[PDB]
Amino acid sequence: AIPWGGNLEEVLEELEMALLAADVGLSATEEILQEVRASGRKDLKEAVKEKLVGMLEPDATLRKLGFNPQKPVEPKGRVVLVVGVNGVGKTTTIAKLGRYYQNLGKKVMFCAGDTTQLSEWGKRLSIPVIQGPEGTDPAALAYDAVQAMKARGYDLLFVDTAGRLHTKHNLMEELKKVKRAIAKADPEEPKEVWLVLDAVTGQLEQAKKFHEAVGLTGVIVTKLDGTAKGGVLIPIVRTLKVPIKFVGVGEGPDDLQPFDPEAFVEALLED
Numbered sequence: 526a527i528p529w530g531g532n533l534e535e536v537l538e539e540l541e542m543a544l545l546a547a548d549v550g551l552s553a554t555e556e557i558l559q560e561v562r563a564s565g566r567k568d569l570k571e572a573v574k575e576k577l578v579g580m581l582e583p584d585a586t587l588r589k590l591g592f593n594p595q596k597p598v599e600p601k602g603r604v605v606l607v608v609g610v611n612g613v614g615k616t617t618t619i620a621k622l623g624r625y626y627q628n629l630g631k632k633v634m635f636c637a638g639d640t641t642q643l644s645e646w647g648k649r650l651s652i653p654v655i656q657g658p659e660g661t662d663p664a665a666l667a668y669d670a671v672q673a674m675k676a677r678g679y680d681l682l683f684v685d686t687a688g689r690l691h692t693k694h695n696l697m698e699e700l701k702k703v704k705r706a707i708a709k710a711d712p713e714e715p716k717e718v719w720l721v722l723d724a725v726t727g728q729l730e731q732a733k734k735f736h737e738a739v740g741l742t743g744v745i746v747t748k749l750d751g752t753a754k755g756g757v758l759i760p761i762v763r764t765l766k767v768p769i770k771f772v773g774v775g776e777g778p779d780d781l782q783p784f785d786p787e788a789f790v791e792a793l794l795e796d
């Protein structure tokens with residue numbers, strides 16, 4: 526419980542505790558504390574919320590404007606390239622993404638570009654999966670998938686990718702190839718490139734490599750039902766500078782929640 530209304534120095538000491546306990550981490554926490562003193566506002570809970578919300582929402586034209594007139598997570602286009610290292614919940618996350626968007630009325634397709642599990646999810650969810658024979662070129666596959674999505678009038682295509690980091694072929698170059706192939710099928714695409722990260726392993730070095738290669742537009746952080754306190758989302762967005770799109774909160778297909786930075790911040794600071 527943080528004493529809003531107590532002495533300036535009392536609020537900050539219990540804020541540091543709350544934030545540190547939440548796994549927001551020393552670097553971000555110190556930043557908030559610095560930011561908060563500076564800003565000589567009487568309403569420090571509202572001031573704290575603004576700084577925490579602020580650092581989760583890194584998305585020029587909006588800077589000039591000062592608000593977003595359109596503000597409900599939805600891909601900006603039809604194709605979402607999903608990237609990440611193996612074992613983070615990439616396949617499962619795609620399955621949950623399909624479920625979530627098909628529950629909203631979208632026609633969703635999957636592309637099995639990790640050349641098993643995805644095909645089976647597609648059957649279960651009644652979602653078509655573009656898939657190929659044992660080791661097919663994932664890039665040629667992604668191109669066929671975008672053409673199939675266009676031709677059959679589908680709204681969303683989720684492209685699964687390899688996540689093995691020290692193989693004979695460079696993972697990042699394979700990704701750029703998939704991304705180039707998608708753009709030959711539809712040059713506006715992929716409008717989303719989404720990194721999947723483990724909460725528990727809330728550790729970002731590799732994550733930056735993903736961004737340099739293919740240009741992230743968002744992150745999905747899985748396993749927020751785990752021992753990692755939810756405050757780890759803060760250093761994730763500070764470091765990556767793309768918003769959290771969804772949070773994974775269990776192993777079943779409905780355990781995916783669109784991220785709400787305002788609800789998150791309110792819950793972070795709750796008594």
Ligand SMILES: Nc1nc2c(ncn2[C@@H]2O[C@H](COP(=O)(O)OP(=O)(O)O)[C@@H](O)[C@H]2O)c(=O)[nH]1
Pocket residue numbers: 609610611612613614615616617618642688747748749750751772773774775776780
């Ligand atoms: N508890 C929990 N488990 C998850 C979550 N997301 C993924 N998993 C589990 O993580 C494991 C790895 O998932 P998988 O889809 O095979 O990961 P991939 O190798 O990254 O494609 C599976 O056992 C999933 O059940 C989550 O949000 N919560």
